[PDB]
């Protein structure tokens, strides 16, 4: 024995069986590959995406000025990050564009011409020309002196004498007109009159008024301001200037668009490092998009052309170009809006009017600007007129500049002048001098401000429109939104039409369409994005769509309402800046595919483990192997040991693949190996559970998958109540394994994500604050379930005359039994003995099996005496169970192994080496014979040789005690003599006990018989002494030829004590009495008997004894039927019975009909509920604390400034933050509450040790941030510890929050620095973060303003006009008046900045509008009290505008088209359950033997396709009831009603006939069952799926081509019909109730070939073509010979007078398509009427075609066979009406009782209803069958189903009848009982033909025979015939002081050829031929002896023993 040698060769063992798949082997190592796979193709197709810090510019709002409001939408429209903190976000800058080209040139120019201390005295030359060309140069009428005019005057008056003064003419005018100094004095009352204004050549002396002298003071000025406009016009920024502006003048330039944009951004924006970024946003799935996704284009139709009125030409023909046009079509739709927007403001009252004239300043200013444009109209002509014919240029500049004094200063001028050019450029009217410098500037300059002024035309500037309820409103909204010429609505819905003043609370809504606001359902995304939500279109449609601009100029209006402060503050918008992140698209479907996987991958290996363990006990071969000696523990731990060599190898192979295909890069895969080893463990734990709930292999292979499959799914609701469950809860939910997979599967990707895995360090702890429950609590919680599995399968696997003859003094007795006793044992005394078998004859029940049992060693007896070779069975049992062998009733042979490893493994395991088994293995497999095939596999073996094998394990190893119970039951009668032989070549010298049943095997092989009657011993002996013993007859056989009177007196002479007992056709047995002397008259007789047997007319005489079995029974004590249309309409009626009584009283055919469907369908209709709807966006007043708790810091910058040391208090004290704790209301849901003083919180000492040691540089604060490396891709930055500095004070509002201040800090550095630490916290869960921070204010900072006033710039402008006469028109007098309220709105001086976090939706406006309800109150007077009042934004979108609608309906929609799935695949699991009953039925040949009784098989098919449709009709109702309850529409609606019930009823009506031709390719129902609602989920899904995705694509010209031939094309399957008409059905009432939104009436109906018409008719049609088909399918399944045998042959050729014949069987034959050889050669027999045939049949040769033939399974090739006129060629169906049949198998149905199984079979036939009352009881009585009556056959003991076959066999009277084995497992006594009935039958007129395999029945009834060697029949005639013409024999025997050597002497003599036989002490065993001379010869005597005769079964041998 051992323990650790028992595992090796079970170890071994399984190790061998499994090699021998090499499917399973190859399949178990290849599919988890091939499913991570793609889980390698999706991190390949899924890339990552990295990006640095963001730092964004500010956005100024409308209350910020004009010129800022503009420039921050131009400068910004793509929102770029910069990795650089801007200038914009510092405690005092708002500026952000301190670098562009126009602000350096503008600095540049103020800085040093400008500001010019060094000549400042322009404005010396200004005043000097001022005051002189108004009174000198003009003059026109004021009065002066002589020499002085308008144009031209004359000193010559005051003359009075008569005229060398011609020489002063030419010395004092010197080539110069009036536009010297002694010249005239030299050349001198001649000398006092010709000199008369002493004022010499000196120039300055005109305007003498009353004093004024200014000419020589320019020199220095006009000398000293030219190098510095060289050297200012020689500096970068000009050059910068200049080089930018060389194109967009020139030609051929500027159309690219990103040229001009470009030139246009670097000369207005001053952005560095090229721009910025644009970040993305690659979401598309939380606004449930689907089209970004699918590549359809999203594009609304293009609104409606007209030709406007009043508007202009130019502007409505280019509005056309800007629309049509491909590339400009949507950067113009979201722009429309604005320019030509208009605004609605509802209740139209006084104060809303107001209001709204206060929020109109952005578009008066903007109106200012077009005007101002617009005065060039008449600026410019004058201004041109000024330069061609004009009084002052042409005749002062141009006429002269004089020509000598000009001469010398252009002499005297700078570098280069050119006069000559300066006059050229000083108008040149009719020259047309075309190079050119002067025409060009002016013509360019008209041409391009004409063009402004014509597209400033286009803008509609007054866009207020009142109206006086809201339903106008919306109604006037939809029609211009129709035109696309919608801004936004205004609703103020607390005033009517006559409110005349304001409460001090204002609230307002703005009412826009959904496609430029954000929805109102959601306020947050539903799962965290790692990105800032920075995308300038797809994240910002409050800014580009105007909702933002709208709400600013209104709340500016309500504030200028009812405040009156003149002291304005505007408004900046800051978005915080982010750090570096990296997002990772993939750890979404790897959480959510990577636990789906890894159980689906064992899906396999569960099914094909569990089949193995259910296998190896369903064959009985665990009781073996616990007989053998192995215990259970060892049978466990070999099977787990086994199923676990193979996951490892796989496991070694996956954690390779996952590891090298960067599925995970930083992980340690130890950890991820010993993750798998864990799973793998429990699963295999598991199947041992699974293994001990089923009894047959395919079930448990069937189910064990989809069990395992379904305890996963608590996963999947699991994951979403992730946050509910407590740590102590997902503890208890984790003892299934499946789910403890999933929470370890979480922190593997929480972990991976952080750049860091698991390596040993972080798995016992965890990425959060408080779970608790860490990625170690996985692994021991699988090591667990392990063991609880364990135990609870190992728990629950327990609990389901003389008689004894005398002997010799001694042969060495090898089994003593004394009085053994149990209770049915009453002290029997038996002594089996060596080297002789022992036959134990006994009953069935009366005490054999308890005693088999007590002497092998398995139950204990109470208080017996057992021995076994000189041992006990009590006091040892290891020892006695070593030499001890047995074999059961069964078989034990282990399939897919060798005969070789057999022996080899049952020698080991009865204890011995290798070597000693490898030695006798070779031994025992000579003697058994099976040298040859010795490698073959156990099964397919010939079936007798499997029993060889089994009967030859029993003797391995050292064996001396060998006891085996019937060992040749049900093998043919060589294979019997094979496994005899076996037998007597190994009782040499070891004792055999030998158990049987049958009577002809217990007399040629056995030494002595003791039978068992009444739990004790009553007789022990030799054969022959028990035949001696009795005393009976030596019955005498005697045959006749083709007279008993006479054959009486024969016998009478020698006159015995018995005449004829039976005398059957051509047949005369004779019974003499034994002993009474008889010696020389018994011899005598055989004398001339034997003589005269010709004459008599005899042929045969035989003497045989009286038989072995009679003395052990003794020891132990139709009218006229019915035919044609009643028999169909019975037939029918009564089928529907048989299959109606089956189903009501069996309960896996009521929970497979009535269960499934309910439920799941209930589970799909109660998904269908919990989904929120599309659409419907609410109300939702916007305000900050529809988030949770949260930070909101603050910050006051330039202080000490009043009116922003009172609007920082009404911010933090007062009112506080918005408008929550105000002073009345204000929703009851946020109430009010209490706060707390200020309060720095505490820090380590380390923090504040490291922030006093070193030196932090105002540029470098605080340390940085790490981020991801090249290797190490990390979520978020790591942030060392002390990253913002040291933390700021604290508070906690009265309205619950926390503010903390941030003043005299960088904020751009704590924000960016301190976010990873809050996400840190906020996370845990990665759905609905809070993010714990949105925005907060920043008070202060100024930008400069232009310090140009007003009037003093009109003073320039009218100066400037007056000095050149231009003096304008009417529009400039209109424009310039407005122009100090004008050049004040451009800027606005002090603002404050509010600083939002984009990651909340609405945190934008909920955040502006606390910053203008806080201004509002920084302003009123001081007499108000400001917490009262305050302003609140409402946002309602508009209606949806059935465009919008379409992809709601798609939506809606996609949850109803799950819905028809869900109901496909429940409602196929009813036809899937008719099937099963099919399968079963065509199987055990139960159908065949309907047709044998004759149902034709039409009938059968109808009369089943009938009852199924009525049996799933219940099924629908059902179904079609739940659906009424759920009250749903569309469905249960009035109308369609109809429609759903005529959709339920028509499926069934087609898809029951379609699965009928699968009950032909299966023979496993489970099989069946599993490979149906496969192939229907298959189809089903994607019948209804890719129609439904196929449609979206409304362009691509070919996929509406390839789904309109699918439309039509897939109609063939009725899953398709239903899927496509449930859809339509949702579909069509979707349409219909769009319409009634708008007030319409689709009114659509069903039955109209469209929606379900052409589905309601496929299934009509092909639910009747399915049939025909199945009908089909059925349709097409359904020389030198003896002389004897010629005698027949040639006999059969005239059957005209003997046609009383009732079988003919003219010639027969099935030569097989893939043969040669028939199997069945041409045979002819007549059965006369009176006789049972034997048609016996060697095996091996073909005879059971025959049956096949006759019953009417297989087609009679070239045949000829009729029964009583008909014949089975042609009319094989009135003839079936005279035929019985009992099967070999037992074709019986379990769930009836034995009395309607009669009644079915009865009323099959004809004998009308009345009858089988009587009928039926005389069968049941003379069956005998009384208690089992009405049982429930099927349980039934095994031998009663061969009574019942044979009574539904018997039915009627049918003249022939046909049996097939008619007693196989039976006791003698029933064996016998059933005999009696088969010789009555014959004793009345009617033919049997009869089949067997044992020759005891075919010799007790019978009367011919016929022996099917290989071809075809080789023997004929009667038993006693057969027995003398092919045969011998007289087996003598003879008792003894005894001496072999004196008997042996007479035979010595004569009687030559004896065989002898065995040799025993005294008895002898010899062999005569056939000469009967023994009889006479023994006379001569020295006391017993018997000659009998060979039996029957010897003469079949002779035959089998050739070939
Ligand atoms: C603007 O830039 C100039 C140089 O480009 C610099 O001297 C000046 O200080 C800047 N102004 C502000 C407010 O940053
Ligand atoms: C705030 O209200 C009063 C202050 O007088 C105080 O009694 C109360 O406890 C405080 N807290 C709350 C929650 O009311
Ligand atoms: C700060 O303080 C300790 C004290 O020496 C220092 O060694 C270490 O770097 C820091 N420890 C912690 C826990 O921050």
Request: aromatic content about 10%.
């Amino acid at each position: 024995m051992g323990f650790v040698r028992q595992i090796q060769l079970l170890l071994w063992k399984n190790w061998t069986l499994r090699k021998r798949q090499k499917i399973r082997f190859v399949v178990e190592l290849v599919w988890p590959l091939s499913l991570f796979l793609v889980l390698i193709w999706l991190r390949n197709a899924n890339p990552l995406y990295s990006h640095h810090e963001c730092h964004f510019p500010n956005k100024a709002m409308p209350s910020a000025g004009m010129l800022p409001w503009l420039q921050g939408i131009f400068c910004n429209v793509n929102n770029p990050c910069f990795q650089s903190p801007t200038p914009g976000e510092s405690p005092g800058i708002v500026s952000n564009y301190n670098n562009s080209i126009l602000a350096r040139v503008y600095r540049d120019f103020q800085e040093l011409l400008m500001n010019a201390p060094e000549s400042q005295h322009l404005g010396r030359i200004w005043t000097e020309l001022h005051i002189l060309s108004q009174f000198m140069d003009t003059l026109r009428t004021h009065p002066e002196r002589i020499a002085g005019r308008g144009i031209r005057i004359r000193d010559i008056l005051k003359d009075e004498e008569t005229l060398l003064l011609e020489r002063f003419i030419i010395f004092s005018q010197r080539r110069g007109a009036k536009t010297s100094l002694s010249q005239g004095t030299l050349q001198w009352l001649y000398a006092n009159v010709d000199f008369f204004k002493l004022f010499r050549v000196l120039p300055t002396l005109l305007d003498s008024r009353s004093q004024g002298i200014n000419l020589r003071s320019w020199g220095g000025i006009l000398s000293d301001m030219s190098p510095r406009i060289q050297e200012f016009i020689h500096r970068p920024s000009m050059q910068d200037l200049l080089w930018v502006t060389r194109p967009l003048m020139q030609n051929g330039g500027p159309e690219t668009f990103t040229k001009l944009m470009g030139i246009l951004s670097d000369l207005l924006c001053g952005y560095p490092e090229g721009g910025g970024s644009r970040v993305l946003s690659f979401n598309w799935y939380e606004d449930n998009n689907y089209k970004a996704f699918l590549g359809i284009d999203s594009t609304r139709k293009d609104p409606i052309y007209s030709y406007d009125r009043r508007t202009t030409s130019f502007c409505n023909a280019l509005i056309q170009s800007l629309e049509s046009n491909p590339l400009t079509k949507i950067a113009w739709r979201a722009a429309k809006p604005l320019l030509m927007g208009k605004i609605l403001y509802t209740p139209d009252s006084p104060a809303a009017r107001r209001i709204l004239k206060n929020a109109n300043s952005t578009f008066e200013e903007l109106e200012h600007v077009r005007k101002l444009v617009k005065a060039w109209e008449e600026v410019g002509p004058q201004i041109w007129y000024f330069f061609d014919n004009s009084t002052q240029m042409n005749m002062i500049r141009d006429t002269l500049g004089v020509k000598d004094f000009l001469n010398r200063q252009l002499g005297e001028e700078g570098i280069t002048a050119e006069a000559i050019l300066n006059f050229l450029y000083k108008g040149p009217r009719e020259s047309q001098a075309d190079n050119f410098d002067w025409r060009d500037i002016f013509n360019i300059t008209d041409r391009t401000l004409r063009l402004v002024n014509q597209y400033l035309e286009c803008l509609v500037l007054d866009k207020f429109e009142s109206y006086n309820d809201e339903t106008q409103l919306t109604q006037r909204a939809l029609s211009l939104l129709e035109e696309n010429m919608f801004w936004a609505g205004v609703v103020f819905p607390d005033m009517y039409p006559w409110t005349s003043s304001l409460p001090p609370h204002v609230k307002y809504k703005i009412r826009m369409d959904i496609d430029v606001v954000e929805k109102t359902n959601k306020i947050k995304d539903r799962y965290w994005d790692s990105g800032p939500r920075a995308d300038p279109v797809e994240d910002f449609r409050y800014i580009w769509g105007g909702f933002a601009y709208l709400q600013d100029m209104v709340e500016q209006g309500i504030t200028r309402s009812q405040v009156q402060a003149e002291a304005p503050v505007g408004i900046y918008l800051q978005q915080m800046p982010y750090p570096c992140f990296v997002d990772d698209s993939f750890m979404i479907i790897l959480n959510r595919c990577f636990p789906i996987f890894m159980v689906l991958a064992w899906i396999y290996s569960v099914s094909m483990t569990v089949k193995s363990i259910v296998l190896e006990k369903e064959l009985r071969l665990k009781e073996t192997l616990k007989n053998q000696g192995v215990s259970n523990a060892v049978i466990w731990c070999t099977w787990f040991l086994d199923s676990f060599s193979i996951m490892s190898m796989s496991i070694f192979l996956l954690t390779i693949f996952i590891m090298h295909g960067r599925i995970l890069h930083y992980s340690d895969p130890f950890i991820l190996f010993l993750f798998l080893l864990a799973f793998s463990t429990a699963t295999i734990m598991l199947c041992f559970l699974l293994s001990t709930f089923f009894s047959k292999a395919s079930l448990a292979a069937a189910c064990s998958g989809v069990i395992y499959f379904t305890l996963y799914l608590p996963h999947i609701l699991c994951f979403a109540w992730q946050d509910r469950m407590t740590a102590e809860l997902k503890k208890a939910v984790s003892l299934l394994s499946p789910v403890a997979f999933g929470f370890g599967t979480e922190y593997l990707v929480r972990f991976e994500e952080q750049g860091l895995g698991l390596q040993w360090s972080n798995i016992g702890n965890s990425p959060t604050e408080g779970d608790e429950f860490s990625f170690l609590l996985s692994m021991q919680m699988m090591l667990l379930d392990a063991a609880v599995y364990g135990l609870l399968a190992w728990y629950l696997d327990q609990v389901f005359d003389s008689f004894f003859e005398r002997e010799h003094p001694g042969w060495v007795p090898g089994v003593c039994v004394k009085n053994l006793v149990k209770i049915a044992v009453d002290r029997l005394n038996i002594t089996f003995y060596e080297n002789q078998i022992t036959a134990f004859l006994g009953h069935n029940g009366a005490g054999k099996t308890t005693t088999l049992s007590i002497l092998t060693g398995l139950l204990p007896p109470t208080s017996g005496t057992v021995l076994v070779g000189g041992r006990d069975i009590e006091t040892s049992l290891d020892a006695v169970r070593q030499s001890l062998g047995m074999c059961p009733q069964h078989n034990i042979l282990f399939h897919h192994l060798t005969v070789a490893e057999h022996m080899l493994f049952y020698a080991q395991l009865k204890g011995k080496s290798q070597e000693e088994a490898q030695l006798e293995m070779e031994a025992m497999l000579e003697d058994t014979g099976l040298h040859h095939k010795r490698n073959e596999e156990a099964q397919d073996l010939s079936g007798g040789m499997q029993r060889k094998l089994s009967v030859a394990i029993a003797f391995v190893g050292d064996a001396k005690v060998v006891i085996l119970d019937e060992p040749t039951s049900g093998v043919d009668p060589y294979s019997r003599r094979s496994i005899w032989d076996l037998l007597l070549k190994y009782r040499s010298g070891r004792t055999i006990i030998m158990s049987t049943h049958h009577m002809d095997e217990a007399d040629l092989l056995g030494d002595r018989i003791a039978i068992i009657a009444q739990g004790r011993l009553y007789c022990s002996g030799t054969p022959l002494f028990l035949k001696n013993c009795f005393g009976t007859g030596l019955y005498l056989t005697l045959v006749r030829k083709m007279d008993v009177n006479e054959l009486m007196d024969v016998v009478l002479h020698h006159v015995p004590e018995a005449k004829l007992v039976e005398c059957i056709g051509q047949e005369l047995i004779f019974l003499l009495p034994n002993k009474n002397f008889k010696h020389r008259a018994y011899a005598s007789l055989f004398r001339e008997l034997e003589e005269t047997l010709a004459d008599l007319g005899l042929s045969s005489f035989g003497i045989s004894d009286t038989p072995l079995e009679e003395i052990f029974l003794k020891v132990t004590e139709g009218p006229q039927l019915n035919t044609g249309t009643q028999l169909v309409l019975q037939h029918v009626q009564a089928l529907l019975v048989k299959r109606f009584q089956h189903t009501i009283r069996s309960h896996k055919d009521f929970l497979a009909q009535i269960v499934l469907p309910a439920t799941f369908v209930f589970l799909a209709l109660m998904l269908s509920i919990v989904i929120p709807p599309f659409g419907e966006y609410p109300a939702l007043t916007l305000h900050p604390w529809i988030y949770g708790q949260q930070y909101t810091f603050f910050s006051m910058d330039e202080p000490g400034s009043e009116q922003f040391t009172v609007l920082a208090d009404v911010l933090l004290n007062k009112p506080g933050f918005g408008n929550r704790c105000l002073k009345e209301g204000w929703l009851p849901e946020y109430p009010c509450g209490n706060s707390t003083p200020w309060k720095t919180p505490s820090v380590s000492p380390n923090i504040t040790q490291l922030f006093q040691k070193q030196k932090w540089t105002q540029v470098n604060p605080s340390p940085s941030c790490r981020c991801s490396t090249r290797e190490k891709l990390t979520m978020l930055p790591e942030c060392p510890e002390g990253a913002g500095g040291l933390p700021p004070p604290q508070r906690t509002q009265r309205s619950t929050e926390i503010l903390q201040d941030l003043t005299d800090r960088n904020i751009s550095d704590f924000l960016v620095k301190t976010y990873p630490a809050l996400i840190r916290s906020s996370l845990k869960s990665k759905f609905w973060v809070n993010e714990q921070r949105y925005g907060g204010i920043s008070i202060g900072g100024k930008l400069p303003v232009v310090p140009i006033t007003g009037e003093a710039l009109v003073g320039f402008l009218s100066d400037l006009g007056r000095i050149m006469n231009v003096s304008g028109g009417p529009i400039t007098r209109e424009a310039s008046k407005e122009i100090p309220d004008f050049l004040k709105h451009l800027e606005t001086e002090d603002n404050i900045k509010v600083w939002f976090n984009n990651k909340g939706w609405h945190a934008l406006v909920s955040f502006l509008n606390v910053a203008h309800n806080a201004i509002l109150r920084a302003s009123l007077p001081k007499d108000r009290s400001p917490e009262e009042y305050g302003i609140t934004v409402i946002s309602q979108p508009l209606n949806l505008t059935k465009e919008q609608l379409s992809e709601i309906t798609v939506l809606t929609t996609s949850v109803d088209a799950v819905v028809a799935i869900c109901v496909i695949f429940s409602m196929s699991f009813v036809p899937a359950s008719f099937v099963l009953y099919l399968i079963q039925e065509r199987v055990n040949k139960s159908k065949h033997l309907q047709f044998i009784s004759g149902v034709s098989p039409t009938t059968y098919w109808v009369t089943n396709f009938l009852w199924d449709i009525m049996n799933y009709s219940v099924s629908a109702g059902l179904v079609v009831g739940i659906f009424i309850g759920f009250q749903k529409k569309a469905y249960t609606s009035p109308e369609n009603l109809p429609a759903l019930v005529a959709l339920l009823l028509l499926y069934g009506w087609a898809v029951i006939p379609m699965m009928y031709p699968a009950s032909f390719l299966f023979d496993v129902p489970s099989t069946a069952y599993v490979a149906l609602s496969c192939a229907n989920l298959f189809i089903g899904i994607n019948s209804s799926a890719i129609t439904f995705i196929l449609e979206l694509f409304e362009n691509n010209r070919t996929l509406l081509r390839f789904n309109a031939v699918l439309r039509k094309l897939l109609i063939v399957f009725p899953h398709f019909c239903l899927g496509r008409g449930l859809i339509d059905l949702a579909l069509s009432q979707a349409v219909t109730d769009v319409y009634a939104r708008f007030g319409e009436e689709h009114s659509a109906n069903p039955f109209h070939w469209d929606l379900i018409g052409k589905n309601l008719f496929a299934m009509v049609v092909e639910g009747v073509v399915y049939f025909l088909l199945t009908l089909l399918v059925q349709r097409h399944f359904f020389i030198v010979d003896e002389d004897d045998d010629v005698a027949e042959e040639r006999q059969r050729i005239i059957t005209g007078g003997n046609k009383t014949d009732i079988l003919r069987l003219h010639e027969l034959t099935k030569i097989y398509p893939g043969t040669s050889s028939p199997a069945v050669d041409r045979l002819c027999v007549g059965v006369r009427p009176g006789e049972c045939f034997g048609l016996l049949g060697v095996n091996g040769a073909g005879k059971t075609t025959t049956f096949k033939m006759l019953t009417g399974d297989t087609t009679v090739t070239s045949g000829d066979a009729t029964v009583a006129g008909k014949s089975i060629l042609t009319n094989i169906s009135e003839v079936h009406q005279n035929m019985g049949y009992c099967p070999q198998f037992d074709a019986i149905d379990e769930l009836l009782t034995g009395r309607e199984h009669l009644y079915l079979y009865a009323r099959l036939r004809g004998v009308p209803a009345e009858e089988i009352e009587k009928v039926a009881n005389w069968s049941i009585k003379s069956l005998g069958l009384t208690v089992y009556a009405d049982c429930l056959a099927g349980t039934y003991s095994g031998g009663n189903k061969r009574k019942l076959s044979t009574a539904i066999a018997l039915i009627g009277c049918p003249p022939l009848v046909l049996l097939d084995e008619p007693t196989t497992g039976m006791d003698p006594q029933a064996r016998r009982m059933l005999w009696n009935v088969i010789v009555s039958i014959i004793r009345e007129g009617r033919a049997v033909v009869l089949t067997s395999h044992s020759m005891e029945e075919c010799e007790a009834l019978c009367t011919r025979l016929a022996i099917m060697v290989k071809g075809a029949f080789r023997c004929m005639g009667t038993i006693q015939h057969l027995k003398s013409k092919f045969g011998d024999g007289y087996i003598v025997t003879m008792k003894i002081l005894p001496d072999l050597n004196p008997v042996e002497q007479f035979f010595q003599g004569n009687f030559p050829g004896s065989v002898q036989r065995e040799r025993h002490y005294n008895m002898l065993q010899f062999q005569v031929s056939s000469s009967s001379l023994a009889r006479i010869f023994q006379l001569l005597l020295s006391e017993e002896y018997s000659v009998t005769q060979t039996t029957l079964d010897q003469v079949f041998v002779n035959f089998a023993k050739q070939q």
